[model samples]
Target: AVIPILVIACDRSTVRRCLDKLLHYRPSAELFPIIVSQDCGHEETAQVIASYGSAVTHIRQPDLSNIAVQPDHRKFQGYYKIARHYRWALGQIFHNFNYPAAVVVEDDLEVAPDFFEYFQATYPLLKADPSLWCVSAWNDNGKEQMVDSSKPELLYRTDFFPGLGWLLLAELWAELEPKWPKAFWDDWMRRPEQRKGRACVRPEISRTMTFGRKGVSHGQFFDQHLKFIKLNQQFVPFTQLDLSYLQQEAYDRDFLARVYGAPQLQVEKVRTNDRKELGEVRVQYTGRDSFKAFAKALGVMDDLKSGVPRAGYRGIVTFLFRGRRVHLAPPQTWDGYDPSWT
Candidate 1:
C-alpha cells in the first residue's frame, strides 16, 4: 500500500485546516497512513495530531540554531530549505516503512477529494517517462483551459509546478536524496539545468491554495545544499502539473489574468553544467490584453498589483531563464476594473 506523507510547519491553525481537509476527502483513515513532519514546536499542533490518533505519525526536527546566518532571502530559497528537510525526513520514513510511493502535502494547501486517486492512477504513467520530475496537484494557470479532463491525466511541458500537493516515486526520491543540498538550491537562480523546463503530467484535479504567514524556512541552508550536490552530478529531468483551477473564487480573476498574460513576459536563456538546455521565462505585464493572454498561459497572474485594467489592451511578454518558464504578472491595481464594459 502507498503511504501519504504530510509535511507541515508548526502552525496550529494551518495544521487543523489541513487535517480537516484530509478527513473530508478521505474519511477512511485505514486506507492511507499519514506521516507528518513538524518544523515548529507548538503544543496545540501536537494536540491536533494526537486527535488523529494512531493513524498519523508525527516527526519533528529541533529548530536549527544557525538558520539565520544565510544570505539568500528570496521566497524560493525558503521553500528549497523546507523541501530539503522534508525530503530528508521522508527518506527515513520510507526506508523504515518500505512503501512503493508516497504523497507529500504541505499544511496550507486545499486538496480535492480525488487527490489521492489522481496520484495512484498517474504513478505508472510518470514511472514510464524518465523526463517527469514531479506530478503537481496545483497549477497557477487557472485559465489555460485544460487540454484533457475526461481522461485520468494529461502531459505537458512546464518550467515549474506548484509543490503544494504532489506525488513522488521511490526511484525519484532515491535519486533526489543524495543530491539534495542547501547550496545547490541557494544558487538555483543561477543554474540553468535546475531552472530549466520540466516535463509535467497534470491530471484534471482540483487544488487548494496556501494561507497564513509566508516566507521560506531555512531557505539559504537548503539552497547551498542543493548547489553542492548538483556540482558533483549530472542534471536530472523532471515533470510538473498545472492545477490552478482549484483556487477559491476570490483569486479567480487575478489567476485568469496571469495565465493569459504569460507569453508577453521577457525570456532569459542560460547554460548550465548538465549540457541540457536551461533558461527562465519572465513576463512583466503592462495593461494590455495580448500580454494578459500570454501570462495566462504560464499560470502566474496573481502576482500583479492593484489598479490595472482587466480588459481591452493586448500584448505578449516572455522571459526564458535557464530553460524554465517564469511568468510575471502585469503591474496593475485591482480597483480599476470597469464592469460595465467588456
Candidate 2:
C-alpha cells in the first residue's frame, strides 16, 4: 500500500531521531514511503536523513527560514506557525501521492509498538463520526478515565486535544484544510467558552511532574481551547456525529473536575534521554530478566496481534509516561523493532 508518513523536522537532532526511528521499524525497502518536511533547511540534517536511501521523499520549505522568529509571547504561536507549514506541506503530499491516510509525526516524538494498532482501529472511526474531529495519539491532560479499555477502542468529545501526536484521514484533512481560516488559530486561543472540556491522559504514577510545569500562561490555556473549538465547530460535523456510547455525564464531569482540581496537568520530569533509558530497560519479551515490565509500562508490546491483518487499515497507540508528554507511534510490524534511539 502507498502509505505516506509525514514528519515535520525543525532541527537536526529532532530530524535525526525521527529518521532513525523510521529506519528502525522499516529497515527494508519494501516498507511504506515517507515524506520528510523540514522547516529549518539545515544541510547536515537533510544529508543525514537522505543517507537512509530512496524510500524517503525529502521536501524543504525555504519560507520556514528561521526558528528564531518569535510569533508572539505565547510558545504555542511558534507551534502554530509550524502547524501551518505542516498543513501546507501535507496538502502538497496529498495532491501528489493521493495516500488513503497519513501518519503525522513531529521531530520530538517517540512511538510505542502498538501505535499502529491504535491508528488502524481509530482512523476509520474518526472518519465515520464528524463529532470526533481528530484522532490524537497524545492525550495531554490525563483527565479522562479509560472509559472502556476492554474493547480495541472508544471515542469521546474532548474539550481539548493536543496536536503533537496524531493521525489524520484524507477526509478530515480535506475539510479542515479549506475551512482553516487565516486567523482561526489566533482567534481560537482568545475564545473562552471553547476552553471548557479540555483534558489530557498520562501514566498515573507521573501525573504531578507531567502537568506541573512553570511558564504556563492564560494565552497557552486559550490556545488549547481554540484548538478544541476549531476542531469541533469547523471540521467536525456534529449532527452527523454520534457520541451516545460515551458516558457524557462521567466524561464531562471528570474532564471538568480534573481541569479545576489541578493547577496544571503535571510537569514532565522525565527527559527524553531518561525515557530512552526506561524504554531500554523495559522493552523485552517474556518473563523475569526481560524488558516486558518496562515495555508494558510504555505500551509497546502488543500481545493482541494474533488476528488477520485488516485491509487498508492503519493503527496508532499513545504512550503517556508519568509526568511526561504524550508519545505516539504507529504499531510496529511483527519482528519490527524501532531503532530510532541513539
Candidate 3:
C-alpha cells in the first residue's frame, strides 16, 4: 500500500491524457497513492491537478529559469531545471510520504491495463537479486528486429536502463540523488559503471507508450519501439509471477540473451579461403546443446563419442571457429553465467 506512483508532469494536456489512461488502467485496489510532481506553474495544469482532488499529491516546483548553469551545456537551461526538479521531487515523494518503493512515470506516457500487475509481480526480483536495480515496464529492445519478436514469455533481464516506466527503490534513489546529472539524466543512468552491473527485469510487451511529440527525444524513437506495443494482450489476464515469471526457476541463460542479443556460436574452418571470417559459419546460440549442434553441424570434430565436443573453446579453436573474440569465458559459460540455477 505504501508503494506510491510518482508521475513526473509538466504540460497540462499531456498530464491529463496520462492521468486518464493511468486511472483507467489502475487495478481496483484501495488507496492508490499517485503523486503528480509538477515543475511548471501553468494555471490550466494547476486546475487539472486540483481536479484529481484529495486522491492525488500535487507538488509544484518554483520557477528556476534564473538558476545557475553547468559549464558544459549552457544553452539548455530547461534541462538543468528538469534535473534539479527530479532530484527535489524524489526527495519529497519518497521520504515525505514514507513509501517503501515508487513506480515512476512521465506525463507524456500512457499505462497499460496490466501495468500495476507487472510492477507488483516483479518486486520479488528486486529483493531476490541485488544485482537487479529496478523493474521496468518499457523494453529498449521492443523492436521486431531488435528482440525475439515472438511474444511467448512474460519477462527477461536486460542491462539497458529502460527509463520510461520504471520502479526505483529508496536505496537506489539514495545512490542517484547525490550524483544526479545536470542534464541528460536518462543517459547518465544508462552508463555501465554508473549502473554498477545491474539488470532490469522487464516484460517483452511494453506497458507504456509515448504521445508527447514535442519533448526531449526527437525522431524515430517512438516510431521504432514505443509506438507499437504487444501489451501481452494475447494472454487473458496476463501472467502471474509464480507460474509465468519472477520465480527463480523462470530465468535461464538463453532468455537473458534475448535481453541483449543472441551471441553467435561461430564455427569456421582453419586456413581455408572459404574459412575467411565472412559469414564465418557463425550460429547465434544461448544454450549448451545449441552450441554443440553448431559444433557438430560444422564438423568441428571433438568428443564425438558422446556428441558433446571435447575440443573446448581454447585459443586456437577460438580463432578458428569463434564468430567473434570470445571476451571472458567459453561459449558454454558466458554472460555472467549463473553457476547453479535455483
Candidate 4:
C-alpha cells in the first residue's frame, strides 16, 4: 500500500502554500493523512498548520538543543535539529502510528498535480525490491536548457540519494535510524557506501518545484541550485494514470553512458581507482529536475548551455619549484546557463 505524506514544515505561509498544493494534487482517496512536522516553535507557524485541523497531524519540534547557531559555525545547529526531527518523524510514522511507509517532503516545495499519481504508482517497486532505497521525484537531468540524451522514457536507476520529494518504507527507516548521520545528512546519504548497492527511482521529469530563497541550509550554491524548471515536455503535469509505466534497470557503465555525452562533465562518474585521484569534483550537469525539486524541498548547479571556463595557459607551470599564480581567465564563451532561465 502507498504511504501517508509526512511534510516537515516550519515557516507559516510556506507550509500553508505547501499544504494547499498537496491537498489539491492528491487524489480524492480521502487525500490520505498528512503529518506536518513543524520543527520550529513559531506560534504563527503552529497556528497556520493548526488551521488545517484534522486534515494534518501537526507535531512541533520541541526545541531543546545545547548547540548555539552562528554564521561561522561548522554546521548549523538548526540543521542538526532538522536531522534529529527527521529521525523522529519517520519513527513516529513507521514505529508509533504503524504505517508501512511515508512520503517525506520539505515545506518549501510545490507539487505538480500528478505528484500523488507518481508515488502511488511506485509503491509496488518499493515493496517488491529490497535493493531500491527511496523513490525520488526529482530528475537531476531536467534543466530547461540542458538536454536529456537518454530521453529516459520512464525511469533510470541512480546511485545518488535524490532526497527532495521521496518515499521511505517503514522497513527502510528501521534500517536507517540507528546509523543516521549526525549532521549534513543529505551529503552523508549520497556517499558511495550509503548508496553502494541501492538505487533511487526518479522520473524523467521533476514533479515538484522550489522557491526557497531563505533556506535553513547552506547558501553557497543557492544561486545555481534555486532556479525555475521547465518540466520535461513528455511528462508535463503528467496526470494520466498508467502504473505499468514504471520501469527499472541496473546502475552500471552502459546505463550511465546512455544518459550522458560529451560537451559536459559527468557528475555521476564512478570514483573508482584512477577516477578517485581527480583534481576537483565539479558538481554540475547530470542535471535532473528531480534533483532540483528535492533541493527546493531542502533549500539546496552549473550551466552548460554554450558555457564553460574558457581557458588558455598564460605561462606553463614552473613545476620544478613554482607554478603560475591563479589569474582570472578572460570570458571567451560565457560559462553560464541560459540567461533567460535565470
Give per-residue CA lDDT, model 2, range 1-342, as digits (tens): 334568777555446655665555542333356788876666777787777667678887757543443445444555556656766777877776778778777665554434444444455555555444455554332332211122223343432344554666677567557655333342352122332222222111110111211222345643442222111111122224444343344544663343334222111222233533332111212222223233344433322221101000112232335433232222233232222211
Model 2, residue 226: displacement in angstroms? 20
- Count of clashes in candidate 2: 35
The per-prediction CA RMSD against the true structure, in angstroms, equals 15.4, 17.1, 11.0, 12.9
State residue 127's C-alpha deviation in candidate 2, in Å. Answer: 2.4
What is the Cα root-mean-square deviation between model 4 and the actual structure?
12.9
Question: Per-residue alpha-carbon lDDT of model 4 for 74-170, expressed as tens digits?
Answer: 6577677777888877878887889988888898878776687777777777787777788887765345433243343455455456677898888
Q: 131-232, model 1: which lDDT tens digit per residue?
A: 556666654332223212332243233334445567777876675567665643323421334423233444322344454344345446334321221110
- In model 1, where do residues sit more than 4 Å from their true spots? 27-31, 71-84, 143-157, 183-198, 203-205, 213-342
Q: Could you tell me which residue pairs clash in candidate 3?
A: 303-310
How many pairs collide in each candidate, listed in order? 89, 35, 1, 11
Off by over 4 Å in 2: 1-3, 26-32, 62-80, 142-157, 179-342
- Candidate that beats the other on lDDT, 3 or 4, i.e. the better one: 3
Better of 1 and 4 by lDDT: 4
- lDDT-based ranking, best first? 3, 4, 1, 2
Q: In candidate 1, residue 267 scores what lDDT?
A: 22
lDDT of 4: 0.57
Indicate whether candidate 1 or candidate 2 has the larger lDDT: 1
